[PDB]
Enzyme design. Structure first.
Site, PDB file in Angstrom:
ATOM      1  N   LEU A  33     -33.182  -2.223 113.620  1.00  0.00           N
ATOM      2  CA  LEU A  33     -32.102  -1.366 112.573  1.00  0.00           C
ATOM      3  C   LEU A  33     -32.838  -1.983 111.217  1.00  0.00           C
ATOM      4  CD1 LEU A  33     -31.490   1.762 111.997  1.00  0.00           C
ATOM      5  CD2 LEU A  33     -29.337   0.617 112.211  1.00  0.00           C
ATOM      6  N   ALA A  63     -32.406 -12.729 110.274  1.00  0.00           N
ATOM      7  CA  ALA A  63     -32.214 -13.833 111.034  1.00  0.00           C
ATOM      8  C   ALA A  63     -31.012 -14.489 110.995  1.00  0.00           C
ATOM      9  CB  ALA A  63     -32.635 -15.421 109.564  1.00  0.00           C
ATOM     10  N   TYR A  64     -30.864 -14.604 112.201  1.00  0.00           N
ATOM     11  CA  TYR A  64     -30.264 -14.692 113.205  1.00  0.00           C
ATOM     12  C   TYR A  64     -29.383 -13.699 114.239  1.00  0.00           C
ATOM     13  CZ  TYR A  64     -26.913 -19.222 112.289  1.00  0.00           C
ATOM     14  OH  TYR A  64     -27.269 -20.232 112.293  1.00  0.00           O
ATOM     15  N   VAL A  80     -29.570  -5.928 113.029  1.00  0.00           N
ATOM     16  CA  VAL A  80     -28.498  -4.552 113.181  1.00  0.00           C
ATOM     17  C   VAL A  80     -29.247  -3.519 114.365  1.00  0.00           C
ATOM     18  CG1 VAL A  80     -27.596  -2.964 111.502  1.00  0.00           C
ATOM     19  CG2 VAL A  80     -27.673  -5.527 111.246  1.00  0.00           C
ATOM     20  N   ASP A 128     -24.332 -12.129  96.466  1.00  0.00           N
ATOM     21  CA  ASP A 128     -25.811 -11.824  97.620  1.00  0.00           C
ATOM     22  C   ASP A 128     -26.715 -10.694  96.932  1.00  0.00           C
ATOM     23  OD1 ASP A 128     -28.208 -12.271 100.624  1.00  0.00           O
ATOM     24  OD2 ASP A 128     -29.514 -12.599  98.267  1.00  0.00           O
TER      25      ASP A 128
HETATM   26  O1  LIG Z   1     -32.470   6.192 107.580  1.00  0.00           O
HETATM   27  C1  LIG Z   1     -32.936   5.106 107.600  1.00  0.00           C
HETATM   28  O2  LIG Z   1     -34.060   5.401 107.637  1.00  0.00           O
HETATM   29  C2  LIG Z   1     -32.167   3.999 108.676  1.00  0.00           C
HETATM   30  O3  LIG Z   1     -31.246   3.778 108.000  1.00  0.00           O
HETATM   31  C3  LIG Z   1     -30.997   2.708 108.228  1.00  0.00           C
HETATM   32  C4  LIG Z   1     -32.051   1.121 107.604  1.00  0.00           C
HETATM   33  C5  LIG Z   1     -31.521   0.058 107.494  1.00  0.00           C
HETATM   34  C6  LIG Z   1     -29.986   0.096 107.753  1.00  0.00           C
HETATM   35  C7  LIG Z   1     -28.805   0.325 108.388  1.00  0.00           C
HETATM   36  C8  LIG Z   1     -29.479   2.279 108.179  1.00  0.00           C
HETATM   37  C9  LIG Z   1     -27.318   0.097 108.041  1.00  0.00           C
HETATM   38  N1  LIG Z   1     -26.170   1.431 108.394  1.00  0.00           N
HETATM   39  O4  LIG Z   1     -25.412   0.168 108.472  1.00  0.00           O
HETATM   40  C10 LIG Z   1     -28.066  -1.150 108.004  1.00  0.00           C
HETATM   41  C11 LIG Z   1     -27.065  -1.704 107.599  1.00  0.00           C
HETATM   42  C12 LIG Z   1     -27.824  -3.536 107.997  1.00  0.00           C
HETATM   43  O5  LIG Z   1     -26.403  -4.650 107.969  1.00  0.00           O
HETATM   44  C13 LIG Z   1     -26.952  -5.744 107.218  1.00  0.00           C
HETATM   45  C14 LIG Z   1     -25.723  -7.362 107.546  1.00  0.00           C
HETATM   46  O6  LIG Z   1     -24.367  -6.305 107.349  1.00  0.00           O
HETATM   47  O7  LIG Z   1     -26.618  -8.668 107.253  1.00  0.00           O
HETATM   48  C15 LIG Z   1     -28.937  -3.617 108.001  1.00  0.00           C
HETATM   49  C16 LIG Z   1     -29.989  -2.454 107.322  1.00  0.00           C
HETATM   50  C17 LIG Z   1     -29.019  -1.489 107.873  1.00  0.00           C
END
Ligand SMILES: O=C(O)COc1ccc2c(c1)C(=NO)c1cc(OCC(=O)O)ccc1-2
Length: 263
Positions: A10, A14-15, A18, A122
């Site tokens: 998702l 880095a690290y 999701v 950020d």
């Molecule tokens: O509908 C789509 O195309 C995909 O939907 C997404 C795409 C990327 C992310 C999500 C949901 C997240 N839902 O919580 C999400 C959370 C994230 O958290 C990152 C963090 O806490 O560093 C990062 C990317 C995504």
């Protein structure tokens, strides 16, 4: 793979990553962020500790944590909208009325964090997730930190975030106030939504485009794309001396912010 199945990747940062995680019984979805403490254990103890303080309609929901070896799993609202980053058409932006809505919501979120003494540090469009009815949620408290405790403010001294979003004072001063920097990044996100481009690579006197904005050459883009009401607000947010820079309570009284646009 943990009471819930991991269906798709998702946000491969880095690290860790999701993931999208469905429970097979109830069918419910979540975002599992996955941090392998071998590939920090310190910034991650903070993230979750911050996350447990958080509860607001414009901040990504925190459900819990399990340790499972080296592996920390943070169980996080899944936002089926994805990133605001993706609703910005390069060079063009998005309809003024959607931008104003996302900005209202981003403001709400930030007031909230600031009122509990947390700065996100950020704010950028990659970190602004949209839910199913396109509500904006502030995401990723990996760099977040506490700047008021027991009603005492403390200045920050660590540099962080993302250069095009960062406030000039974070480059220039040894200590600065946390809130104005969050305001500045919010302003850059406004410019981003309304023009579909970033105005400069970093707010440096060494940066040409930055020098032209301080000289009020708003005849160049991305400014020329913007329009005089929202641009008047941007003039009040992207002010260099952090002390003369508009505050949130005053953004809430700005003309463009209070303008009807959207059904
Ligand atoms: O509908 C789509 O195309 C995909 O939907 C997404 C795409 C990327 C992310 C999500 C949901 C997240 N839902 O919580 C999400 C959370 C994230 O958290 C990152 C963090 O806490 O560093 C990062 C990317 C995504």
């Amino acid at each position: 793979v943990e009471d819930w199945d991991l269906v798709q990747t998702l946000g491969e940062g880095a690290y860790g990553e999701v993931q999208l995680a469905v429970n097979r019984v109830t069918e419910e979805a979540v975002a599992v962020k996955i941090v392998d403490m071998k590939r920090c254990p310190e910034n991650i103890k903070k993230e979750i500790c911050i996350n447990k303080m958080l509860n607001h309609e414009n901040v990504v929901k925190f459900y819990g944590h399990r340790r499972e070896g080296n592996i920390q799993y943070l169980f996080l609202e899944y936002c089926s909208g994805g990133e605001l980053f993706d609703r910005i058409e390069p060079d063009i932006g998005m309809p003024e009325p959607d931008a104003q809505r996302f900005f209202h919501q981003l403001m709400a979120g930030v007031v909230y964090l600031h009122g509990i003494g947390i700065t996100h540090r950020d704010i950028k469009p990659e970190n602004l997730l949209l839910d199913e009815r396109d509500n904006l949620k502030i995401s990723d408290f990996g760099l977040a930190t506490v700047f008021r405790y027991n009603n005492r403010e403390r200045l920050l001294n660590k540099m962080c975030g993302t250069l095009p979003y960062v406030a000039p004072e974070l480059l220039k001063r040894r200590e600065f106030h946390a809130e104005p920097v969050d305001v500045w990044s919010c302003g850059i996100v406004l410019t981003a939504m309304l023009a579909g481009e970033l105005p400069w690579d970093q707010p440096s006197d060494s940066c040409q485009e930055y020098s032209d904005w301080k000289e009020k050459k708003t005849y160049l883009n991305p400014w020329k794309k913007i329009d005089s009401a929202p641009l008047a607000l941007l003039h009040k947010i992207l002010v260099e001396n952090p002390s003369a820079r508009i505050t949130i309570p005053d953004i809430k009284k700005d003309r463009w912010y209070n303008k009807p646009l959207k059904k």
